[PDB]
Design a protein around this ligand. Structure first.
Ligand SMILES: [Mn+2]
Ligand SMILES: [Mn+2]
Lengths: 178, 178
């Protein structure tokens, strides 16, 4: 006898709203909200996660970073409990495109068990979507480099979820990175 | 102490996938997934619904009718429990748009307590959207006719949620139908 709370729906609704104009960079140009959901869903379904603070955190694992939202909006809306994990998985968009990816490999291990979960999911889902389907106007080379970078981050996040990481490795095995 | 099940997430994901290409009729052309979400959230936050069966059904209240999904898919994936309500709120698309509306008023009050909840919220959300933005290429008269019809249907769905219906009325008296 389970069920999401009113806070979780107000969060799902929020991410949906706040990303309303953002789209995933694919041929179809599918809504970006799908991503965040795929990410939050991976943890629920695949990672069998039963804690909303993580499921809502994942729903917002790109708002304060790709939207015009702030940790405060999240804070005054969903509390510090989740403002923490959303901050723990948000990049400093004041740093150059590359400096953030390089920093993602370093700060990886230092993260928390809960934040590592989101980080792995964010990766897994992105990869699943990158296999075969190449981003809009994306160099075929660049398409590979992501895989290289993704694994480097995923390698410093290990020890978190056996199942998520497993599936991740299955994506690197096929491609030929391990 | 609560959290959404792995099924509600697979359902959220499914709704989001099947609708991926569908968009709402507004100037911005916002994703349709945002609508089904609002309907589920409308019940959760407002109306305070603690039953996933209804919540998922709401997330899927437009798939069987707009997307290429079927009752067997919902039945196969979520069960009669969810398949039963989703069918209770899906207009037979073999009929013409004008007839599908006429029946909504007739089969309205004949619906189940649970199915009325979705039907009400479904209306509330849409209406809320008709006050702010006007559908792409739509005359003001037709924009008005929707409110009238909405009321005729909602007038037969009443007796269900004193809160949703109270708000429904808020949209009807502000306009000038109540
Ligand atoms: Mn992401
Ligand atoms: Mn609808």
């Amino acid at each position: 006898a389970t069920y999401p709370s009113a806070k979780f729906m107000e969060c799902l609704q929020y991410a949906a709203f706040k990303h309303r104009q953002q789209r995933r960079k694919d041929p179809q140009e599918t809504p970006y909200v799908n991503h965040v959901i795929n990410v939050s869903t991976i943890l629920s379904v695949e990672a069998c996660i039963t804690d909303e603070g993580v499921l809502m955190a994942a729903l917002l694992h790109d708002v304060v970073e790709d939207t015009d939202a702030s940790f405060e909006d999240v804070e005054k809306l969903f509390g510090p409990d989740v403002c923490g994990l959303v901050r723990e998985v948000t990049d400093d968009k004041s740093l150059e495109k590359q400096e953030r990816k390089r920093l993602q490999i370093e700060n990886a291990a230092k993260s928390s068990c809960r934040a590592k979960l989101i980080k792995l999911a964010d990766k897994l889902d992105n990869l699943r979507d990158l296999q075969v389907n190449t981003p809009t106007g994306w160099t075929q080379e660049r398409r590979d480099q992501y895989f290289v970078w993704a694994k480097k981050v995923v390698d410093n996040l290990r020890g978190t979820n056996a199942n998520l990481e497993l599936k991740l490795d299955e994506i690197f095995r096929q491609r030929g990175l391990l």
